[PDB]
Design an enzyme around this catalytic site. Structure first.
Site, mmCIF file in Angstrom:
data_model
loop_
_atom_site.group_PDB
_atom_site.id
_atom_site.type_symbol
_atom_site.label_atom_id
_atom_site.label_comp_id
_atom_site.label_asym_id
_atom_site.label_seq_id
_atom_site.Cartn_x
_atom_site.Cartn_y
_atom_site.Cartn_z
ATOM 1 N N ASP A 236 -3.648 -98.806 6.976
ATOM 2 C CA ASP A 236 -3.824 -98.432 8.369
ATOM 3 C C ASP A 236 -4.460 -97.071 8.632
ATOM 4 O O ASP A 236 -3.797 -96.046 8.533
ATOM 5 C CB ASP A 236 -2.447 -98.500 9.042
ATOM 6 C CG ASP A 236 -2.518 -98.325 10.539
ATOM 7 O OD1 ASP A 236 -3.632 -98.173 11.078
ATOM 8 O OD2 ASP A 236 -1.446 -98.349 11.169
ATOM 9 N N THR A 237 -5.742 -97.070 8.991
ATOM 10 C CA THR A 237 -6.446 -95.824 9.276
ATOM 11 C C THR A 237 -5.940 -95.172 10.563
ATOM 12 O O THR A 237 -6.240 -94.011 10.835
ATOM 13 C CB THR A 237 -7.961 -96.058 9.411
ATOM 14 O OG1 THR A 237 -8.212 -96.986 10.474
ATOM 15 C CG2 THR A 237 -8.523 -96.625 8.108
ATOM 16 N N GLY A 238 -5.173 -95.920 11.349
ATOM 17 C CA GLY A 238 -4.648 -95.379 12.591
ATOM 18 C C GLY A 238 -3.296 -94.687 12.433
ATOM 19 O O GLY A 238 -2.734 -94.180 13.403
HETATM 20 C C1 LIG Z 1 -1.367 -104.263 19.178
HETATM 21 C C2 LIG Z 1 -1.549 -103.199 18.044
HETATM 22 C C3 LIG Z 1 -1.664 -101.809 18.691
HETATM 23 C C4 LIG Z 1 -0.425 -103.265 16.906
HETATM 24 N N1 LIG Z 1 -0.600 -102.241 15.847
HETATM 25 C C5 LIG Z 1 0.128 -101.065 15.785
HETATM 26 O O1 LIG Z 1 1.011 -100.756 16.612
HETATM 27 C C6 LIG Z 1 -0.188 -100.141 14.660
HETATM 28 O O2 LIG Z 1 1.021 -99.721 13.934
HETATM 29 C C7 LIG Z 1 1.227 -100.375 12.658
HETATM 30 C C8 LIG Z 1 1.706 -101.769 12.873
HETATM 31 C C9 LIG Z 1 0.944 -102.902 12.389
HETATM 32 C C10 LIG Z 1 1.427 -104.247 12.626
HETATM 33 C C11 LIG Z 1 2.681 -104.416 13.355
HETATM 34 C C12 LIG Z 1 3.444 -103.275 13.844
HETATM 35 C C13 LIG Z 1 2.961 -101.957 13.606
HETATM 36 C C14 LIG Z 1 -0.840 -98.947 15.305
HETATM 37 O O3 LIG Z 1 -2.072 -99.339 16.029
HETATM 38 C C15 LIG Z 1 -1.115 -97.823 14.328
HETATM 39 O O4 LIG Z 1 -2.309 -98.182 13.618
HETATM 40 C C16 LIG Z 1 -1.198 -96.471 15.043
HETATM 41 O O5 LIG Z 1 -1.715 -96.579 16.435
HETATM 42 C C17 LIG Z 1 -2.399 -95.431 17.034
HETATM 43 C C18 LIG Z 1 -1.387 -94.794 17.866
HETATM 44 C C19 LIG Z 1 -0.930 -93.439 17.557
HETATM 45 C C20 LIG Z 1 0.103 -92.840 18.415
HETATM 46 C C21 LIG Z 1 0.647 -93.586 19.538
HETATM 47 C C22 LIG Z 1 0.189 -94.933 19.846
HETATM 48 C C23 LIG Z 1 -0.835 -95.555 19.011
HETATM 49 C C24 LIG Z 1 0.178 -95.761 15.035
HETATM 50 O O6 LIG Z 1 1.133 -96.184 15.682
HETATM 51 N N2 LIG Z 1 0.230 -94.608 14.246
HETATM 52 C C25 LIG Z 1 1.378 -93.724 14.039
HETATM 53 C C26 LIG Z 1 0.818 -92.291 14.126
HETATM 54 O O7 LIG Z 1 -0.071 -91.928 13.362
HETATM 55 N N3 LIG Z 1 1.388 -91.488 15.101
HETATM 56 C C27 LIG Z 1 0.841 -89.943 15.237
HETATM 57 C C28 LIG Z 1 0.146 -89.633 16.581
HETATM 58 C C29 LIG Z 1 -1.254 -89.878 16.737
HETATM 59 C C30 LIG Z 1 -1.902 -89.587 18.003
HETATM 60 C C31 LIG Z 1 -1.119 -89.056 19.078
HETATM 61 C C32 LIG Z 1 0.284 -88.826 18.878
HETATM 62 N N4 LIG Z 1 0.880 -89.114 17.652
HETATM 63 C C33 LIG Z 1 2.137 -93.993 12.663
HETATM 64 C C34 LIG Z 1 3.359 -93.060 12.398
HETATM 65 C C35 LIG Z 1 2.685 -95.427 12.568
HETATM 66 C C36 LIG Z 1 -0.454 -104.627 16.211
HETATM 67 O O8 LIG Z 1 -1.440 -104.950 15.598
HETATM 68 N N5 LIG Z 1 0.685 -105.382 16.355
HETATM 69 C C37 LIG Z 1 0.825 -106.714 15.756
HETATM 70 C C38 LIG Z 1 2.275 -107.148 15.681
HETATM 71 C C39 LIG Z 1 2.788 -107.757 14.477
HETATM 72 C C40 LIG Z 1 4.206 -108.158 14.458
HETATM 73 C C41 LIG Z 1 5.084 -107.951 15.624
HETATM 74 C C42 LIG Z 1 4.448 -107.328 16.784
HETATM 75 N N6 LIG Z 1 3.098 -106.946 16.800
#
Ligand SMILES: CC(C)[C@H](NC(=O)[C@H](OCc1ccccc1)[C@H](O)[C@@H](O)[C@@H](OCc1ccccc1)C(=O)N[C@H](C(=O)NCc1ccccn1)C(C)C)C(=O)NCc1ccccn1
Lengths: 99, 99
Positions: free
Chosen positions: A25-27
């Site tokens: 996950d690059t995000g």
């Molecule tokens: C609809 C999609 C958005 C969903 N995917 C996710 O939620 C991904 O999480 C992994 C993931 C993958 C699959 C299922 C669950 C979780 C995230 O997009 C992750 O890439 C990243 O997002 C950017 C972001 C940063 C900060 C706040 C909000 C958003 C994120 O949350 N990053 C965090 C981060 O870096 N936070 C720091 C930060 C950055 C900027 C600002 C503030 N803080 C990490 C700690 C996890 C999905 O595909 N669901 C399917 C799905 C599958 C099963 C069940 C339900 N849904």
């Protein structure tokens, strides 16, 4: 290798002598794994995602093998829907985005 | 280009005549943008990730320009703290993970 994104970029990782599936996950700034046992002491950390924040346990200098590439770094453990390999470890294996 | 992951892979996108900053997110199935006005009819949807679920509005056939490359796809609009370009659009611009 080269991974396309038509499907989730899931890879097999090895940690604690066990094989698990994890998402590249690059995000994600950090690496977050589902509830499991890890050695050593942990520190608290709050991370934010799309749905809000959650409390996780932070373990340092953990050995993890991603697709055959060994990495040693910080891993967070908590109520995550799937195992996530974040930028902290993706940089260790030389992973880049290309287009 | 080739994007390293030492920092968050933020890029400039163009949607609805507006220039916005977004995250190239391989861990996101869908593309989610902060609240904004888009043309056409929409459908409610619940999406989840770290922290839980949020309610968003789903717009289809939306044109987005990413670093110059045009792409068409579904875009979700809702209370996300950061703009996310997910796999549905990353594939259209030929984005891949390499290591
Ligand atoms: C609809 C999609 C958005 C969903 N995917 C996710 O939620 C991904 O999480 C992994 C993931 C993958 C699959 C299922 C669950 C979780 C995230 O997009 C992750 O890439 C990243 O997002 C950017 C972001 C940063 C900060 C706040 C909000 C958003 C994120 O949350 N990053 C965090 C981060 O870096 N936070 C720091 C930060 C950055 C900027 C600002 C503030 N803080 C990490 C700690 C996890 C999905 O595909 N669901 C399917 C799905 C599958 C099963 C069940 C339900 N849904």
């Amino acid at each position: 290798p080269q991974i396309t994104l038509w499907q989730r970029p899931l890879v097999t990782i090895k940690i604690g002598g066990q094989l698990k599936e994890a998402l590249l996950d690059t995000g994600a700034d950090d690496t977050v794994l589902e509830e499991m046992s890890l050695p050593g002491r942990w520190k608290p950390k709050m991370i934010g995602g799309i749905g809000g924040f959650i409390k996780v346990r932070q373990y340092d200098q953990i050995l993890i093998e991603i697709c055959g590439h060994k990495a040693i770094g910080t891993v967070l453990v908590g109520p995550t829907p799937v195992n996530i390999i974040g930028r902290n470890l993706l940089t260790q294996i030389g992973c880049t985005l290309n287009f």
